[PDB]
Amino acid sequence: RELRIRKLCLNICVGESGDRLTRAAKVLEQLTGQTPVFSKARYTVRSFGIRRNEKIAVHCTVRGAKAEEILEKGLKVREYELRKNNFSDTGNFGFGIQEHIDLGIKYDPSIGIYGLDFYVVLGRPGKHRISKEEAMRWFQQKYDGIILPGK
Amino acid sequence: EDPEISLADYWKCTSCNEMNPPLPSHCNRCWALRENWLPEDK
Numbered sequence: 210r211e212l213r214i215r216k217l218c219l220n221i222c223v224g225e226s227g228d229r230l231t232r233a234a235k236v237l238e239q240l241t242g243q244t245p246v247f248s249k250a251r252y253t254v255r256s257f258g259i260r261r262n263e264k265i266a267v268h269c270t271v272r273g274a275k276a277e278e279i280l281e282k283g284l285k286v287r288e289y290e291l292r293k294n295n296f297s298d299t300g301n302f303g304f305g306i307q308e309h310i311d312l313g314i315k316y317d318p319s320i321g322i323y324g325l326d327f328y329v330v331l332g333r334p335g336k337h338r339i340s341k342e343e344a345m346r347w348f349q350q351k352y353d354g355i356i357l358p359g360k
Numbered sequence: 361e362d363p364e365i366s367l368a369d370y371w372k373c374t375s376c377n378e379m380n381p382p383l384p385s386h387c388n389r390c391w392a393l394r395e396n397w398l399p400e401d402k
């Protein structure tokens with residue numbers, strides 16, 4: 210009752226600039242009501258066709274009621290079930306889902322399917338550190354969530 | 361780069377040992393996927 214969501218970050222990876230990237234931006238706009246920011250490759254990676262500094266992904270930060278809602282959609286897709294691996298030592302956590310359509314976005318054969326990354330940074334409604342275990346029982350109590358053993 | 365997270369939010373790629381920001385969930389050096397991020401299939 211005294212631990213809150215500070216922000217939810219979302220990210221869709223494509224790997225190169227073009228149609229599929231720009232469509233991943235739209236998906237984030239539809240899903241989120243905000244404009245996403247394109248990410249650039251940190252390194253070129255020959256065997257994956259990645260070039261340094263190329264736009265290759267899109268991300269968006271959401272706060273407040275919007276963040277809670279999107280998180281819930283994500284958790285429902287995951288059936289409210291994460292692993293201890295998903296929880297950082299900082300008291301934050303994240304996870305992925307295979308298909309964005311499962312949040313309730315319509316499938317378009319033109320668009321295709323996107324994987325989606327979630328990262329949730331927690332905070333206190335006020336600087337005392339949030340442990341990995343506090344975030345775990347927060348998730349367990351607030352969402353009746355299940356945290357599978359570490360793999 | 362981002363004041364709301366720390367290095368403790370970073371994950372270590374087990375293929376090449378690169379420290380990677382929370383997002384994306386593949387390694388920025390070698391592209392290897394992070395383990396136990398996605399739901400496990402049956």
Ligand SMILES: [Zn+2]
Pocket residue numbers: 221222223224265266384386
């Ligand atoms: Zn990526």
Ligand SMILES: [Zn+2]
Pocket residue numbers: 373374375376377378387388389390391392
């Ligand atoms: Zn790597």
